[PDB]
Design an enzyme around this catalytic site. Structure first.
Site, mmCIF file in Angstrom:
data_model
loop_
_atom_site.group_PDB
_atom_site.id
_atom_site.type_symbol
_atom_site.label_atom_id
_atom_site.label_comp_id
_atom_site.label_asym_id
_atom_site.label_seq_id
_atom_site.Cartn_x
_atom_site.Cartn_y
_atom_site.Cartn_z
ATOM 1 N N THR A 1 -2.759 4.974 -0.022
ATOM 2 C CA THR A 1 -3.952 4.200 -0.443
ATOM 3 C C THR A 1 -4.790 5.047 -1.401
ATOM 4 O O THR A 1 -4.737 6.288 -1.350
ATOM 5 C CB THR A 1 -4.784 3.745 0.761
ATOM 6 N N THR A 19 -3.084 0.026 -2.430
ATOM 7 C CA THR A 19 -2.141 0.750 -1.523
ATOM 8 C C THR A 19 -0.698 0.242 -1.624
ATOM 9 O O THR A 19 -0.451 -0.887 -2.127
ATOM 10 C CB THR A 19 -2.644 0.616 -0.084
ATOM 11 N N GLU A 40 3.963 -2.595 3.663
ATOM 12 C CA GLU A 40 2.675 -3.177 4.122
ATOM 13 C C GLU A 40 2.890 -4.010 5.389
ATOM 14 O O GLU A 40 1.946 -4.090 6.196
ATOM 15 C CB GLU A 40 2.013 -4.034 3.038
ATOM 16 N N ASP A 43 1.766 -3.118 8.890
ATOM 17 C CA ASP A 43 0.342 -3.318 9.251
ATOM 18 C C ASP A 43 0.201 -4.513 10.204
ATOM 19 O O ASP A 43 -0.856 -4.594 10.874
ATOM 20 C CB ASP A 43 -0.527 -3.461 8.008
ATOM 21 N N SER A 63 -7.303 -2.415 6.694
ATOM 22 C CA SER A 63 -8.590 -1.777 7.037
ATOM 23 C C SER A 63 -9.324 -1.383 5.755
ATOM 24 O O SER A 63 -10.396 -0.794 5.866
ATOM 25 C CB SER A 63 -8.345 -0.606 7.941
ATOM 26 N N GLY A 83 -7.045 5.755 3.917
ATOM 27 C CA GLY A 83 -6.845 6.373 5.245
ATOM 28 C C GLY A 83 -6.600 5.408 6.407
ATOM 29 O O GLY A 83 -6.930 5.791 7.551
ATOM 30 N N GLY A 84 -5.984 4.245 6.177
ATOM 31 C CA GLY A 84 -5.637 3.270 7.233
ATOM 32 C C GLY A 84 -6.843 2.865 8.062
ATOM 33 O O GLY A 84 -7.903 2.558 7.488
#
Ligand SMILES: [N-]=[N+]=CC(=O)OC[C@H](N)C(=O)O
Ligand SMILES: [Ca+2]
Ligand SMILES: [Ca+2]
Ligand SMILES: [Ca+2]
Lengths: 182, 361
Positions: A1, A19, A40, A43, A63, A83-84
């Protein structure tokens, strides 16, 4: 990201988080086309039945938190981070440090962050005092012996008092801010 | 160049070559959207592990003419072949993350390029060709890689060794190191095709076909029909008030906006700047608050085209006050669970609350 931001001489403001999920995504590079393919869809929840279950043509929950802060209907600050799940932590802590603590933008960004999404998951940046870490853990927290960098905030402050833009790039990557004059 | 000031424009990015390219668009009279498009292409080349036309993003734009804030939403979509249980093995056990994150089933239909074009159509003042060309040059002629890219190649060499990536990033089976020149001829060619034909080369063209073919090679279901179906959406921000400011952030299908706003609403009443920024009190109250907001995120957040996210309830001041009763300097809350924000808006969830193992990353 990655998160980046742009302001122009016409009052347009961009806050853009983008990302391919993991670093290099799946790691699959399209043979003969040189581009990495996202992972992705991890997620999504792996166990279905929930709000973020896999379905065809569904978008997996992100997020990513590209943000613009306004004062009297005028943009004053852009915030975002990679950073997720920690992105939420990077963005709210930057805003807290800037508006609640009244830090400089660079101090608000550089101030060590913490992240904990659950009783079993804690991260903190170097700079949390050792004695405070021990007190937190004695109280029931689980901050480990090793600090880790959390996120990568790029921000622009729009200073209407001084008729300037101020750009800040987080020290956690080799990012830069580049101002423009006429 | 960590901090900058400028009268007429500002760029901040994670890569100095992308910041320079963005600035140059503004120096040549391009707008922030022109510069942002140039920046996404430049990051695709210089920070290839983090983003690009193989992925998706959320581009928030404040329009200085209309004074409207909107988001170009290029989040990826599951292909038609995806199934709800595709990340479970035949015994219903979650497939380990290091395996599922590397499989063709993991690849969403990429939206980033669609988003750049949607942004360009709306706000663009430079020819798309002027915005992509600086990135063709970096891909074609190469650039010396930075420490973060060199570290990324090293940390992900197992994954990269099993794909066509190994030839570019692991030459002679060895990771490129900081200062080594990264040349991406095939990426330059892909950018040239897009420059010539626009996104139909991707979503209805040879790039789309090659994407579908390699996804299927790695066990995924994505076809050219999945790529041809894809369109970006335009979202309104989720808004919250904090400390006399109005905050515009990302709605579902991000959890980001609502839960960043929820944390600020939960902590606002604690007046944290009464405590040192490195105090036990500040860290404790943030940890206790994050536990509540992340628990809500795990129960209530998903793609709003498929599920109802209780945004009204999650930010309701009475819901906030109820959750605050769990946040205290007196102890650590050991009974962390989602609240009931459905109690504060109309309707019911159209899903169960399904616990997930803590395995992502
Ligand atoms: C890398 C990284 O920040 O991951 C982003 C994540 N896939 C998200 O969309 O929230
Ligand atoms: Ca205050
Ligand atoms: Ca940091
Ligand atoms: Ca069985």
């Amino acid at each position: 990201t990655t998160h980046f931001t742009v302001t122009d001489q016409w009052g347009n403001v961009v806050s853009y988080t983008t990302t391919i999920e993991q670093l290099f995504g799946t790691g699959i590079l399209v043979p003969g086309y040189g581009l990495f393919l996202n992972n992705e869809l991890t997620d999504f929840d792996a166990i279905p039945g929930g709000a973020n279950e896999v379905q065809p043509n569904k978008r997996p929950l992100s997020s990513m938190t590209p943000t613009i802060v306004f004062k009297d209907e005028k943009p004053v600050l852009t915030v975002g981070s990679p950073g997720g799940t920690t992105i939420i932590a990077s963005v709210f802590q930057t805003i807290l440090n800037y508006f609640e603590y009244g830090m400089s933008l660079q101090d608000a960004i550089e101030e060590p962050r913490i992240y904990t999404n659950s009783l079993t998951s804690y991260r903190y940046e170097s700079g949390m005092p050792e004695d405070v870490r021990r007190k937190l853990n004695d109280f029931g927290h689980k901050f480990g012996s090793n600090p880790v960098d959390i996120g990568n905030v790029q921000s622009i402050f729009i200073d209407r008092e001084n008729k300037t833009f101020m750009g800040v790039a987080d020290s956690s990557r080799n990012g830069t801010a580049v101002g423009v004059n006429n | 160049d960590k901090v900058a000031v400028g009268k007429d424009g500002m760029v901040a990015t994670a890569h100095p070559l992308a910041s320079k390219i963005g600035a140059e668009v503004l120096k040549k009279g391009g707008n922030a959207i022109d510069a942002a498009i140039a920046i996404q292409y430049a990051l695709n080349v210089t920070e290839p592990m983090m983003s690009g036309i193989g992925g998706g993003g959320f581009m928030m734009v404040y329009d200085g003419e209309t004074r409207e804030t909107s988001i170009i939403n290029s989040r990826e979509r599951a292909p038609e072949g995806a199934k709800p249980d595709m990340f479970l093995d035949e015994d219903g056990k979650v497939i380990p993350f290091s395996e599922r994150s590397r499989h063709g089933n993991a690849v969403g239909v990429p939206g980033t390029l669609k988003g750049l074009e949607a942004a360009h159509k709306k706000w663009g003042t430079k020819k798309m060709e002027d915005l992509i060309s600086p990135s063709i040059k970096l891909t074609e002629e190469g650039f010396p890689i930075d420490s973060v890219l060199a570290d990324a190649i090293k940390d992900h060499q197992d994954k990269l060794s099993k794909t066509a990536a190994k030839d570019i990033f692991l030459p002679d089976g060895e990771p490129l190191k900081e200062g080594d020149i990264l040349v991406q001829k095939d990426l330059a060619k892909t950018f040239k095709l897009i420059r010539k034909e626009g996104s139909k080369a991707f979503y209805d063209g040879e790039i789309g076909r090659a994407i579908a073919d390699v996804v299927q090679d790695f066990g995924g279901s994505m076809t050219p029909d999945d790529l041809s179906r894809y369109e970006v959406t335009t979202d309104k921000p989720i808004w919250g008030e904090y400390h006399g400011y109005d905050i515009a952030s990302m709605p579902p299908p991000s959890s980001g906006g609502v839960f960043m706003l929820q944390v600020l609403k939960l902590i606002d009443d604690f007046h944290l700047s009464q405590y040192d920024p490195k105090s036990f009190e500040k860290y404790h109250l943030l940890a206790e608050t994050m536990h509540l907001s992340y628990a809500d995120r795990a129960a209530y957040a998903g793609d709003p085209e498929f599920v109802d996210v209780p945004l009204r309830g999650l930010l309701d001041p009475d819901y906030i006050k109820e959750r605050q009763k769990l946040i205290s300097l007196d102890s650590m809350n050991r009974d962390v669970k989602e609240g009931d924000p459905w109690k504060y808006e109309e309707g019911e969830p159209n899903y169960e609350i399904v616990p997930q193992p803590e395995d992502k990353t």
